């Protein structure tokens, strides 16, 4: 007994029976195609990690940029469509600098996440502007930064909803990686332990054996700014594991 009519999934701005709005749900399914990314929030800081998924050896590893810097205080890790990710990263950067210009201060991670979320919401097309993509943004972002409230990790999804999360995983193996996060995570863990645990989980989920090339790792601590672990630092930690 199979009923597969759907007939309402096509076209945003259509509420299907039971009012589910399936285009956005399919966009939320889309990030599972992306590489797994992982974030852990700790008192010492917030760390972000992602698997690069290098297709060929000739491709330059540095060019793959799945962790980026919105500003010194906030960094982002993304999984999903690289292009619309670039769009949202641009929105985040310009909004941070606009806040600096207007108020001579640094945005909070929640405010930056809300700023990008407002842009993500515009798929509904309530605004009359032509230059807004009709489709929802097929990307999920992890916003990690140290603010007045300390280390904070925010998750953003294609819907534009956002929440703080002590630890979250996005991408293909988010299911199962989140269970591993739930068992390992305790609020007291230091950033060293968080880095090690996140790399353990990434090693588990990743098809290829983990190496300094195929992962990208970053941390923002209260004293420091956003920092990316270099080849040597990545070598040290992946050796320590």
């Amino acid at each position: 007994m199979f009923l597969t009519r759907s007939e309402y999934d096509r076209g945003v701005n259509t509420f299907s029976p039971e009012g589910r709005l399936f285009q956005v749900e399919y966009a939320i399914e889309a990030i599972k195609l992306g590489s797994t990314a992982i974030g852990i929030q700790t008192s010492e800081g917030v760390c972000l990690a992602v698997e690069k998924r290098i297709t060929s050896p000739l491709m330059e590893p540095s060019s793959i940029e799945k962790i980026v810097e919105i500003d010194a205080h906030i960094g982002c890790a993304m999984s999903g469509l690289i292009a619309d990710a670039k769009t949202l990263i641009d929105k985040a950067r310009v909004e941070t600098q606009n806040h600096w210009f207007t108020y001579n201060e640094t945005m909070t991670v929640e405010s930056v996440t809300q700023a990008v979320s407002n842009l993500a919401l515009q798929f509904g097309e309530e605004d009359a502007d032509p230059g807004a993509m009709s489709r929802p943004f097929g990307v999920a972002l992890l916003f990690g930064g140290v603010d007045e409230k300390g280390p904070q990790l925010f998750h953003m999804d294609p819907s534009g909803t956002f929440v703080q999360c002590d630890a979250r995983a996005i991408g293909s193996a988010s299911e199962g990686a989140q269970s591993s996060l739930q068992e390992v995570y305790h609020k007291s863990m230091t950033l060293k332990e968080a880095i090690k645990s996140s790399l353990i989980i990434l090693k588990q989920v990743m098809e290829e054996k983990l190496n300094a090339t195929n992962i990208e790792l970053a941390t923002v601590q209260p004293g420091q700014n956003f920092h990316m672990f270099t080849k040597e630092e990545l070598e040290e930690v992946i050796k320590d594991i």
């Binding site: 199979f2 039971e18 749900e25």
Partner: peptide, 12 residues
């Protein structure tokens, strides 16, 4: 479910 029935279609 009214939608997300592609998984059902594979089974069919």
């Amino acid at each position: 479910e009214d939608g997300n029935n592609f998984g059902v279609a594979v089974q069919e």
